[PDB]
Design a protein around this ligand. Structure first.
Ligand SMILES: *Cc1c(COP(=O)(O)O)cnc(C)c1O
Ligand SMILES: *Cc1c(COP(=O)(O)O)cnc(C)c1O
Lengths: 397, 392
């Protein structure tokens, strides 16, 4: 078997498992306590927070632990609404700007708020030419009531990277004018789930006020975190949860020490090795694309992740094989080596996301998402490409 | 060293750790996906759900996994408010009835709703006679706008068990009359965090519509679950989170398979051994109280967890040693064997009518599965020693 669904989830690094397993046995105490077991836990959590900050070029004061990317993403949106309501408690609705290709945990909370008449939202389309939301279109959607721009750093289906530094830069410049006109500053969030561990992620270069971190996309456990620039002092955060004071009351509940241990260790590995991970992923992905074009013919392959001049994740190859019988899911069902997907694991009809990218229906119908990882080898690419060869041959008879 | 703070948290059972580590290595796949590491994951999650159902005498369809007791408790409150808003949009506010001794993850979200003028809340005091919220007072607090009664099944500080079955029964009876007057039915939740694994918890006996489960109170991992009676069909649940369809869209987010594997295994051990666990804790806790009274003298000891007639957890002993110097935190600080807690004196003990002088000397000892009578003897001697040097 060969796994190429790393965008859906990654296995745990053995050092990550070690951190978690040891924490289970040795660090089991309530972190709020002065005994060995609880003091050990507090230390693990403090160290983990430093690691996360280091991974994204931030400070630990700006990181809070969460149950995962879904929570982190929901919390940013929740907080922006609560903040608006608190400013007015002193019927206008807050406005959000986002992209047409966001994860369910950004798109769905925003749809819900529109349905419920709590907020206004602009879903900015991606360019059919660049595959990015144009920064001009984002700036053209601004209203007096706009309070958040949320744009994913990299798309999970295509791998396409969004122009988040430009967005932040242009929003900061706009905000100077807004504040001077009595219009509150617009905050910027990016869902960085798919970028972490695949390319450098640095909050100063990104310029963002919030950033979502998702452990299971970078060989860490199924918990997450949220970066909040100057949490408290510069960026407000209104909690969704109320209880016993943990995470400075931004995210109460007894801390999950083993999960935090794992997340911290997964972050350390990214900090040490990101450049090597990126290099490896790119070599094997590019090699996959070369072998697919040599084996099937350049005329028969649509590279759906390639938009001219647009940066993408090093590990992602979304592509389609031309043929009326070669719908993605049917091709995968005949493969005996390849384990991959046709889109988001959680959506397991063509991908709405690909259609939003302007991929024609005949192509989108045949799309397969292969996403490689740290251990993936060229020999494994060769095995996968032969597997695809036999599967297409099977369906063509 | 001897641990007697199991009400704060438990260590993990060895079996629980193995379920988790096995899932880490072998069941790492996305559960939403189809393939080895991922079918393995979905299998684990399904089996765990059945285990949790079995522990509480319910069905797996009525169980959702959460990140912990705080999320589960907040989710119940949130849902009741949303439901009320949904009903009205086709300035009335929902009303909640709760107790004065709830955990921060029930008390604080309710306080926040009062502060934000989103809901009305009655915090019903506990009687200083029985140490329980009187069911009469709960029913007397009912309003047309009442939508939820939430009363913790056992208190974490004192161990005192609340009359949740009576509460549920009297509310169900009220509801027949309410519905026939065009008044919506009142739902009942119990935070069962402190009862699970210490005494039998059964949703049919309890009569509740919602029930919070907290893994780290019963030798499981730091995640949780929520029971919702006839989830979908009978009891509404409006989610807090939006995302990719997991937990039937009641609680989206990629499932934490290893945590779930551990919670399921912890639940399996409770189902298999709950009675043995109860009997052991009761023996050891009762021996603790005997040995305290023998060593310090009966008149020297206030047993704060003891109200005559009133049921309590088998493992909990909240007590005070009478003495000007013997404030709880100072006594613990001088102990070299006992590891425990005091819970300023506890606001919860004050709410129980414990006089200030006794309250501030209060120590909370809560014993566990492994605690022995020999360990009790060590702890009681350590206490004597500690008291002696604070008395010079
Ligand atoms: C421990 C506990 C909880 C859950 O709190 P978490 O910090 O989220 O584990 C809830 N209620 C009671 C009574 C508890 O003792
Ligand atoms: C995987 C992922 C997430 C995190 O969602 P969870 O299911 O909670 O892990 C968030 N955003 C994107 C773009 C993702 O790919």
């Amino acid at each position: 078997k060969v796994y190429m669904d790393y965008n859906a989830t990654t296995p745990l690094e053995p050092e990550v498992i070690q951190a978690m397993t040891k924490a289970m046995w040795e660090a089991w105490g309530n972190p709020s306590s002065p005994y060995s077991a609880g003091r050990k836990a507090k230390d693990i959590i403090n160290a983990a927070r430093e690691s996360l900050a280091k991974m994204i070029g931030g400070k630990p004061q700006d990181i809070i632990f969460t149950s995962g990317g879904t929570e982190s993403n929901n919390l940013v949106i929740h907080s922006v609404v609560k903040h608006f309501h608190a400013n007015q408690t002193s019927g206008a609705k807050p406005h959000f700007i986002t992209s047409s290709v966001e994860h369910d945990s950004i798109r769905l909370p925003l749809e819900h708020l529109v349905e419920e008449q709590v907020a206004a939202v602009t879903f900015v389309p991606v360019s059919k030419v660049s595959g990015q939301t144009e920064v001009d279109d984002i700036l053209a959607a601004v209203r007096p009531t706009t309070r958040l721009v949320t744009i994913m750093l990299a798309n999970n289906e295509t791998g396409i990277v969004m122009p988040v530094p430009e967005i932040s830069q242009r929003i900061k410049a706009l905000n100077q004018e807004r504040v001077a006109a009595g219009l509150p500053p617009i905050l910027v969030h990016t869902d960085a789930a798919q970028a972490l561990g695949k390319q450098r992620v640095d909050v100063e270069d990104l310029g963002v006020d919030f950033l979502t971190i998702v452990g299971h996309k970078f060989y860490g456990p199924r918990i997450g975190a949220l970066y909040i620039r100057g949490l408290g002092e510069f960026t407000p955060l209104y909690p969704m949860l109320f209880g016993g004071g943990q995470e400075r009351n931004f995210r109460p509940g007894t801390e999950n020490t083993p999960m935090i241990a794992g997340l911290g260790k997964a972050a350390e590995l990214v900090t040490q090795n990101c450049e090597a991970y990126e290099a490896h992923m790119r070599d094997v992905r590019d090699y996959l694309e070369e072998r697919l074009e040599a084996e099937f013919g350049q005329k028969r392959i649509h590279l759906n992740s390639q938009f001219p001049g647009t940066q993408r994740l090093p590990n992602t190859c979304n592509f389609s094989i031309r043929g009326p019988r070669l719908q993605g899911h049917v091709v995968l069902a005949q493969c005996r080596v390849l384990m991959a997907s046709v889109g988001a694991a959680c959506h397991s009809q063509p991908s709405p996301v690909l259609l939003s990218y302007g991929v024609p229906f005949d192509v989108a119908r045949n799309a397969l998402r292969l996403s490689v990882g740290r251990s993936t080898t060229r020999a494994e690419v060769d095995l996968v490409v032969q597997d695809l060869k036999q599967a297409v041959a099977q369906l063509e008879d």
